[PDB]
Structure 1
Amino acid sequence: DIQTERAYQKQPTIFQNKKRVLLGETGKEKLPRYYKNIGLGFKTPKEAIEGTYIDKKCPFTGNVSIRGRILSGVVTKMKMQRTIVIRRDYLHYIRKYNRFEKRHKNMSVHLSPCFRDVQIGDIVTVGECRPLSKTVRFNVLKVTKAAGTKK
């Protein structure tokens, strides 16, 4: 499932190549995991702790720093791999005609693979990080489900 690619994927902090004694079972073949806390009152999911995936652009299990602005939005498409696109909606004011303006603009957000129950139409909270690509400047921190889906 992992290392389906010509370049090896590994975490650059945990040394996985220590010396073993009995060279078998009974307390071994359990890889240690590296994680960290983002802060700002956020919670690290257990799927990023007990997970097995390798991703350097993950905010929790990776070399990604979170600072700056905190936003929110609703997703539209999951087509490109490991990055999603969300839609943000806001009300603009016009000074001449004393009314309001509903407009939108969308942005590309990197999605960590620790969320696997994500679907169309749920409100997600994103955070500012480093420029990871040309159009990618945000990362997914927590996911709140949409209205309904009781079963």
Structure 2
Amino acid sequence: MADQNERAFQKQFGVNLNRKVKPGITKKKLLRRSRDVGLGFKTPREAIDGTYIDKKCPWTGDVRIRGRILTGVVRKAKMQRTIVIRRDYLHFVRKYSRFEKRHRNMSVHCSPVFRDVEHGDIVTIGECRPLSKTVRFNVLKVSKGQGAKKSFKKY
């Protein structure tokens, strides 16, 4: 992406790598501890390997993704570190004794751990600490990102 090059030096609160005085070394070069997303939700391994600062990320940030787990389809991948999902469902109105198909279009934060997020991906989103006005969610799993043909590379 960017080499986390913003006007400020991007640092995570409470991790300064201590060169000087404290017992030496077994490789990895990084004090980066990484998550178990645990509603049996498996981590993407780029969390552990992530140079990316993202303080609004649950993998690199001091945030809980708290509450409602919903599954939806990405309609717009356009934004740097957030995506739009449209969820479309039947709401049964008893009066009309038929439904109306109805939509809610909601912005949801894509941490840059999640790569090949493209419209039309089915994505598992969790309500998040409500992150920037229309962004009230964060992606807990990209369950699609996909390409059932594309997973194994076509000749």
TM-score range, shorter chain: 0.7 to 0.9
Q: Which amino acid aligns with 2:149?
A: T
Matched, 1:13 2:14: yes
Q: Which residue of 1 aligns with 2:148?
A: 148
- Partner Cα distance (2:124, 2:79) in 1: 19
Q: 1:100-125 deviations in whole A, cap 9, x for unaligned?
A: 11111100100010111222211000
Give how far 1:143 is off.
Answer: 0.9
Q: Which residue of 1 aligns with 2:48?
A: 49
Superposition TM-score, scaled by structure 2 size: 0.83
- Partner Cα distance (1:128, 1:115) in 2: 17
Structure 2 counterpart SS, 1:102: strand
Q: Which residue of 1 aligns with 2:91?
A: 92
- Partner Cα distance (1:19, 1:148) in 2: 50
Does the 8 Å contact 1:38/1:66 carry over to 2? no
Give how far 1:27 is off.
Answer: 6.5
Superposition TM-score, scaled by structure 1 size: 0.85
Q: Which amino acid aligns with 1:124?
A: V
Does the 8 Å contact 1:76/1:85 carry over to 2? yes
- Partner Cα distance (2:94, 2:75) in 1: 32
RMSD over aligned CA atoms reads 2.2
- Partner Cα distance (2:83, 2:133) in 1: 14
- Partner Cα distance (2:13, 2:34) in 1: 12
Structure 2 counterpart SS, 1:132: strand
Structure 2 counterpart SS, 1:47: helix
1:22-41 correspondence runs (5 A): 30-41=29-40
Structure 2 counterpart SS, 1:131: strand
- Identity %, equivalent residues: 71
Does the 8 Å contact 1:85/1:108 carry over to 2? yes
Q: Which amino acid aligns with 1:133?
A: S
User: Paired residues, what number?
Assistant: 147
Q: Which amino acid aligns with 2:77?
A: M
Give how far 1:30 is off.
Answer: 1.5
Stretch of structure 1 that moved more, 11-20 or 88-97: 11-20
Unaligned runs of 5+ in 1: 21-25
- Partner Cα distance (1:117, 1:32) in 2: 27
Q: 1:27 to 1:97 in 2, by over 3 A?
A: closer
Q: Which amino acid aligns with 1:66?
A: I
- Partner Cα distance (1:117, 1:29) in 2: 26
Give how far 1:28 is off.
Answer: 6.2
